[PDB]
């Protein structure tokens, strides 16, 4: 539940 | 290929709603998270929103929060943007932009032409 | 919340000649997550560098990009004809990303 968490698939 | 295209842009009076779409192409589109961006007439560049590739997550700035609503459908390859109450300050060519690879952090390495909001009375 | 403050305001060179454009942050970007962007007046942003100095696809190499922690720097060796636009730096080390207020590289005649 980061805000700053990149938003893709297994990346 | 990688385009996104957006629409639903147009007048809306101060208070009233106005929803946005962005068709996307060129690429999967369940894989990857979608931003909004905004940039008002003369100024720069302001992040809006954004969406998880599975639409779990979707985080907003404090410009807009409890205002704006980002949802999006894979099956059709569209984002959406429902934005409520719409005020002076939202005047504003919304893009919306792919996220880019990253460990963390949001960069967007493809937009779109951009769609012009004018909130006016 | 980080501000980015690029500077000049505007840069006024010549085709062929080195341009040097600073962002300058107020908290340090963490992992040097510096992204630089081109746009022209009436056209979309467009990535140039990520990673502050990772170049993004189909970008010249007179694009660089420099920089670490509160002072960054991208660089055009050679002044292309299609390089005089605006250029964004935005940071994506904190909860919200932030964009700076843009320097505009001139034609100079």
């Known amino acids: 539940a980061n805000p700053n968490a990149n938003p893709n698939a297994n990346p | 290929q990688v385009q996104l295209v957006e629409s639903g842009g147009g007048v809306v009076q101060p208070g009233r709603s106005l929803r946005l779409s962005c068709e996307a192409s060129?690429?999967?589109?369940?894989?990857?998270?979608i931003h909004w961006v905004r940039q008002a007439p003369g100024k720069g560049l302001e992040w809006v929103a954004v969406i998880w590739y599975d639409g779990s997550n979707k985080y907003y700035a404090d410009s807009v929060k409890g205002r704006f609503t980002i949802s999006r459908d894979n099956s059709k390859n569209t984002l959406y943007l429902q934005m409520n109450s719409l005020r002076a300050e939202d005047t504003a060519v919304y893009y919306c932009?792919?996220?880019?690879?990253?460990?963390?952090?949001?960069?967007?390495?493809?937009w779109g032409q951009g769609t012009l909001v004018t909130v006016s009375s | 919340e980080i501000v980015l403050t690029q500077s000049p305001g505007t840069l006024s060179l010549s085709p062929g000649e080195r341009a040097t454009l600073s962002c300058r942050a107020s908290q340090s970007v963490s992992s040097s997550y510096l992204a630089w962007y081109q746009q022209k007046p009436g056209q979309a942003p467009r990535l140039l560098i990520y990673?502050?100095?990772s170049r993004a696809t189909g970008i010249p190499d007179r694009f660089s990009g420099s920089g670490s922690g509160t002072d960054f720097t991208l660089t055009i060796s050679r002044l292309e004809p299609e390089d005089f636009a605006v250029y964004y730096c935005?940071?994506?080390?904190?909860?919200?990303?932030?964009f700076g207020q843009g320097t505009k590289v001139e034609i100079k005649r």
């Open positions: 990673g502050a100095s």
């Open positions: 060129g690429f999967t589109f369940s894989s990857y998270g």
């Open positions: 935005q940071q994506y080390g904190s909860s919200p990303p932030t």
């Open positions: 932009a792919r996220a880019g690879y990253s460990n963390y952090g949001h960069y967007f390495d493809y």
